[PDB]
Subunit: 219 residues, 4 copies
């Protein structure tokens, strides 16, 4: 039966049928948003949902026999596995993000339609070039986050109280989001010199970020 | 009579006369802004305004006898038709926005003068080389918007209570506009881990946007 | 005496004596900032000021005989002229920005030193290859600023009440400064669809602004 | 004994031992953040600290014999000296920032690992080609910072009261951080024309900054 299924799975109709399902479960998920819609068609949607989930595991099962090892060395395939697997944990127990993480299957429209794959791959491929910088920065954030925690977290614990909090705040300053009126001006009412910590921080982090982008507009 | 009017329409004087009317009507519309000016010279204005609208329909009528089907295959011509069209719907009934949409005719200055046409066309021309990415993002926004609506819309309905609102709020975070003190910090007072949703959201969306820009610094 | 002075003006000493004065008057102007310093050495620096103002007029006079018509066709010279002229208008009368515009002379350090001149000129020269774009944008701002005034000015006059106000607010949205929580969200409490005006406005304006930057990276 | 140690220092083991210490002290410094961890194992980590600081000075001592004048002409080497030196200054007296500045030693992970050194060097190397522009801006900031102090510092001393504050505030406008609702709109409630100072300021400073990035995508 091997070549029978290898001709079912690999068939245009099979793929195009999967894609047709994604776009339907996709649409169906944007409807599960309406409290109104659930009070009229809630049952329709939960069933339709459970259905598609089977169809996708059947498919993923079929897909595996036709590929075996070759499959668990395909990024795109692994993805579909894990995404469907997430969708498999029952509508219960554990955390509830799993019920929410289900909507990740709409990312299959990327995986199971070229052009997306291409563009996605075009994007991801840039990442290796950045890891030298990214590393540098994370060391930097780690260093400043520590300094910040022990300079400001006594009077300003919301913002710098914990190593993690400083990380968050520092990230915020880096996105330049409300950094002066929101954060540094307050700090200064107590620690006049706080500007000496944040202006340099901003220069460095924005400098690095400009290089990093110019780096990507060459490779 | 055709070649008579073809010579009239194609005549530089005709074009330049149109362009002259635009720069007059534009100035007129900026004066229609002043409550003072309208009490003084509102009469002068509304008639000069209606006059121009006639002239522009006559022109557009003339312009079609001289181009026929070639016209409705011209972007710029279509534009002008559709723009003057808007301005034709009476100063009453339906949606008061129409009366306001009238000012779109000042975009005829773009259409009736080249170099503008050049620059605009230069701009537009970049779009198709972006649609692979734009689509990618929209799928992303769509996925996260749904996730957010079901993660935060109960305690935070202004911001996430609805698919639309999540779209809006998500866009706002993307523009990095007041995203931390304005939104995530609040969110966190209830959902400590909301940073796990938004920091990734921010990296991705910002990354994509950098690639999209560099993509245009190649083509 | 012509060639005598033509040898004084062109003299490296003279030029370097000018640059020396600038850096002093510059230093002197940052000292004039302190209320304390003025209560000690105010009279010192006021005279020192009037002194330098003469020296600079003497020079610009000498500079003219030596160059005549050639001088009033030099950007950098015209500048130096006008910036000294401002510094000549009596310490009284009219507007008091003239007392404040006097600090523009420190821009002579840009004029009187190359590399600065190089860099300034390098910058400026990019401008003509932007005017096509700048025009487009200004037309756009003018169009939207009009729409906005007659759509939100009635309920929201601080922000859109006047053509100028809308220009201002629009600029602010363009810099993406506090635009959603600060403006569009309030707007929406009254005009639910105001998002329809501002999201597009942002796309256009930021798209256009990105192209304009990529233009300056191929020129 | 010279060549004996020149084979100790210049050994793989040595370097990799140093790197191993950094990553350990680094982890130790993130644990010193927790008030909990300090009430438990504070003693462990305070000793561990003095230990590493010894090892590092011994190493730096060794490193100098093996290198002499070649060492105090290596950026990276000088760094480690200075950084370790700061870490030597007793746990008392003067200012406490010295105690905090100690965490700068984690920058040795950059000093003492290539690729980092490469990437950092890549970045720093870009700087000299910016000094022409940077200079320009600092003159510009200085000129406007002075202007602002005398136009707004009387009614608005938090923001422009002192030369320094104006620098700070102006910097903030440059990052476009809450500049309109936070600063200019208020300023305008008293000085209607303040927009005539800040909008130009913003174009110039943003324009320049755009070029400066385009420069770094050519050099
Ligand atoms: Ca803000
Ligand atoms: Ca902001």
């Amino acid at each position: 039966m091997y070549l029978r299924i290898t001709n079912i799975v690999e068939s245009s109709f099979f793929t195009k049928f999967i894609i047709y399902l994604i776009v339907l479960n996709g649409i169906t998920m944007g409807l599960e948003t309406s409290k109104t819609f659930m009070q009229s068609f809630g049952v329709y949607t939960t069933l339709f949902n459970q259905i598609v989930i089977t169809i996708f595991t059947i498919e993923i099962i079929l897909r595996i026999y036709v590929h075996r090892i070759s499959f668990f060395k395909d990024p795109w395939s692994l993805f579909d596995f894990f995404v469907v697997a997430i969708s498999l944990v029952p509508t219960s127990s554990g955390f509830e993000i799993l019920r929410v993480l289900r909507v990740l299957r709409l990312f299959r429209l990327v995986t199971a339609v070229p052009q997306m794959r291409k563009i996605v791959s075009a994007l991801i491929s840039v990442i290796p070039g950045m890891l030298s910088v990214i590393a540098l920065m994370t060391l930097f954030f780690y260093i400043f986050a520590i300094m910040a925690t022990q300079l400001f977290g006594e009077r300003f614990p919301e913002w710098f109280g914990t190593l993690g909090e400083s990380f968050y705040t520092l990230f915020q300053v880096m996105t330049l989001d409300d950094w002066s009126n929101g954060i540094v001006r307050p700090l200064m009412e107590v620690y006049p010199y706080a500007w000496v910590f944040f202006i340099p921080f901003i220069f460095v982090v924005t400098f690095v970020m400009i290089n990093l982008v110019v780096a990507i507009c060459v490779d």
